[model samples]
Target chain A: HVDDANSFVRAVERACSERGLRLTPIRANVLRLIADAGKPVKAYELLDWVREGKGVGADAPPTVYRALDFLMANGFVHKLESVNAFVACHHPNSAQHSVPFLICDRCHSAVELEDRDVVSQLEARAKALGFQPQAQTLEVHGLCAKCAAA
Target chain B: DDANSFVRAVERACSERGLRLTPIRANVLRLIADAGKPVKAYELLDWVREGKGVGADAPPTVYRALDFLMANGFVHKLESVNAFVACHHPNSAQHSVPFLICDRCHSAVELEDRDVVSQLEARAKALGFQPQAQTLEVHGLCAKCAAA
Candidate 1:
């Protein structure tokens, strides 16, 4: 549903602005590249995109990593740990969120499921067990609807 | 628990299950269990090289070992870190265990909560996604790290 780059980037920019966060050009480009990808985009893959674009800086790798770190910390993106890639969070307006990902094994597409209860319950469970959890990587690997049908 | 005992249990489990646990695979298992911490494949390969059975710089040999170990539920890979740790319940059938990872010290411990894993699976099932496996890892400061 979050297929529009204009809306996604704009919402993220607004969120950053409200939180007094600077959406640097490099970081914004990273955000845009992820949103446009529609699937999980690897860090090094993004580096190539940034390289092919304007200003091929000598420090492109670190610049890309820094941009990713900022976007992830600010909740504009989510890192799919299994695939070692990054995806644009559906709800970028929120400062933070944790959603379960349904990653298709066939086509390698990822869908973020919307469920507030699951995330909150997991956090509560962690707190009860004496852990101060900051982030969760909850991904379920399986076939998507289309892939399963195909 | 004793790493020696753990290896024996895995060996017994493998025998009962009728799966081949080659010397290379068992060696990798011993290395992981003895480490008592999540170890990367690169490190495992480096250690595997010290032995004569596997050659130097052969990643596939170790990778295959890990795959066998993982398939048999003897090891768990932390997706966030790309490292492997011995599963706490290797005797049981393959299942999911949520991991609590520490960022400061890079330590990891299994949550051992079945209810959480079940609830997550049920929720995914409700969404019409064919379930297969899960990657549930939480990252933060551990109790010691937070207190310090």
Candidate 2:
């Protein structure tokens, strides 16, 4: 899965085109790193990758942070607020909605569960408060199937 | 009912427990009684100032008194509405009370039924997750608002 493949490159290309932003080699490298990781990766760790490759200047912290934020807004990635890190959004450029994550603590493996009922019921409950919610996140921290087997 | 035996019950509850239910606390309880509706913490703050000079208690002080009242079961925290109200059953013994708050007027009400508790527990059980703290917030328009 970590090997360089044309299909993965095409996915990145699609994200850039749909978002109307040019994907630089550095940004592409960062996205690829997260895709290859198959897990959540911290911002500082990604900065270390930039350092090794000389992809960014000495004071490009804001660049990486801004890129991450842009990627999140465009549905190319998601910032797991519970973990305070970024993960590649497995579903690229779909309609925005609630996402519930099942995270494995031992191995940092994550899986996004697709459930419509969970999101709708929760929204109806919150609406009774007269609070208009923009997004809903339900993060269940536990062991995944592979990690639980291990 | 404004200054009847019910008020005495509140005073007695405070006195027996050695709680210094100051003028601020007493006045807040009175405002809720007189209004016959749910009151926000800030509204209570203004009401406190009207009777007790001006600029005596800050936000933290009012919140502290409100917090004490909530813990003692004298008041209720309508989390879904982000407000507070004097408990109608203040004289009743303390326990977890399920509330029905009006979305229109912020009228928080207490129910004597246990069905909501059972429903929440059953839902939590289905998730395989033990509920450490249960905040069963049920928000809806009250009968008053529905009629209006």
Candidate 3:
């Protein structure tokens, strides 16, 4: 449980290095921001936060997009396709597993749980129906405990 | 008789929506009208070409008209199938309707789910994500097909 920001920095350093990659300063900051963020972070918003030293150019979007893409391709990040945003993968460097998400509609927060057997059953059923599923986004949307009281 | 009713439905709905219901739209609608089951967009385009609507009716025209018809509620777009079907209830305002697609016969029906509203509301709230367009599409065998 690395509750300290510095610990997250170190973990990102070690994790990316083991994968033969570098957590470039900008990318690391973006991950740090998301880790601190109580909710998901969209790309444009992250760009805004990280754009201070990048010389302020028109192509800043592509830069941020590239960084986000790099992070997501690795286990350190996961994009919420339903929300079109990014979140720090809590279980980083973990094996491939089903990403069953419980997304909060009110706050836009998400929790990812991985289970294989359940997904296998779903895939089997779809295959039996002659419909090839290109992707399966199993998201159950509802109110978080805090939002329910509000 | 059903084909006649389908034509009337298409004409009246297009008239009400201020759309042209052009030869292509009519021909595509007619194909869906005659299918007695769901058909894909490309299949409808094939029919349009066969009807001599245009030797060169590109995907854009047929697909765009299908989009317009879908937006105007004259047809249903099955996201799961990437296909379209004539609106079972064309005269009414569009609402969230579910689909029961038969895997065996390729037949489908639009259904109003008895508990979708509450179920979606609960699901959305629990997840902290807004569901822009919700359709709980289920593909399964119909009783007739299952019996066979």
Candidate 4:
């Protein structure tokens, strides 16, 4: 997973170069923080990290949100609606429609899942109801094995 | 089929779990079930204040009751919308609950799928993780609203 995370960072850097997109220092730092976090992170928490790591006390809500928006639009991060948090995307290059996550309630860690069957089933069900589906998010909350056994 | 049956079921569930459902908590549960739709905490607080006299309840009072109900499986919180709804299968054993929410009407329908949970659990096992609960919510339109 560490290698995967690092590879993602490299891919992002290369992609930005090719696409002429600007990955600013703050944006890059935020993206790396989410990738390395191994869990969903809140904006305020990210603000603290930005302040401590970058020593930029002037960083405010809009600055962080703008960075988050850019990262999210480019498929580098996914937002967990239920918890109002952010998690790094493992498979950044691939176009993923529905984002499914397994959240550990005890530990507050979220694991992104690639379940195609679940996604199709949900889309099919929505179509069966004659409704057009837009963004889809599925979150599973439970205790991770380590926490459950403990 | 009526509110009485639901109230009785809650009382029975609490008794079976050896827990107490105080009047305030019970009132909150009834309000959520009676709504037949997802209700927000602030909305519940407002209603509780009007019904039980001002200063008789506050935001914390409502939230605490909601927390107790959710923990006991008598109620469920829709994380996507940040509201609460009564569980369709309360007496049944606790498991992962998936929901289909209508953006137009704010109505939610809970879907019980054994295979979905199994598939998810298998993935978690592959990763050496244990799942304790799940909140899978899909946002879209319902049949009636779609037709309208």
Q: Against the unseen true structure, what C-alpha lDDT does each candidate score?
A: 0.62, 0.52, 0.53, 0.61
Across A17-121, the per-residue lDDT of candidate 3 in tens digits comes to 432355676677677777666467887788777766455553367767766655654434556755777776432222234454554433445565343554444
lDDT of 1 by residue, B13-123 (tens): 565334577777878888987887679877898898886663554678778788777644466566556788864532232544655544334455566667775676566
- Candidate 2 lDDT by residue in tens digits, A14-44: 5345323567666677777676665579989
Give the per-residue lDDT digits (tens) of candidate 4, residues A1-150. Answer: 547567667767765653335788778888988877776799888888888886746567688877876776544566664577897643332235546566443344555566678656655656564444433243443446675566
- Which 10 consecutive positions of candidate 3 chain A have the poorest summed lDDT? A131-140
Predicted candidate 2 versus true structure: per-residue lDDT over B19-118, tens digit per residue: 4667666666666666655567778778766755755777676766665565444566665456775544322324445454443344554543455445
lDDT of 1 by residue, A1-150 (tens): 444576778867765543335688998889999988877888888988888776645345887888887776444576664577888754322234456565443344455656677766766776776556443343444434564455
> What TM-score does chain A of each model score against the native chain A?
0.59, 0.54, 0.54, 0.58
Fnat for each model: 0.33, 0.00, 0.05, 0.28
TM-score of each: 0.39, 0.32, 0.32, 0.40
lDDT of 3 at A54: 55
- Model 2 stretches astray by more than 4 angstroms: A1-6, A55-59, A91-150, B1-148
lDDT tens readout by residue for model 3, B1-148? 5666667856754443234667667767777778756678778777777755646678787876665555444466554566777544322224445444443344445544344434544444344433333333333334454443
Candidate 4 — what's its lDDT? 0.61
lDDT of 2 at A128: 49
Best by TM-score: 4
lDDT (Cα, tens digit) per residue for candidate 4, span B1-148? 5456567766755553335677788788788767766788888888788875755866786777886766444565565577887654322235336555553344555555567545655776665455333343444545565564
> Which portions of model 1 miss their true places by more than 4 Å?
A1-94, A97-108, A134-150, B1-96, B102-106, B128-148
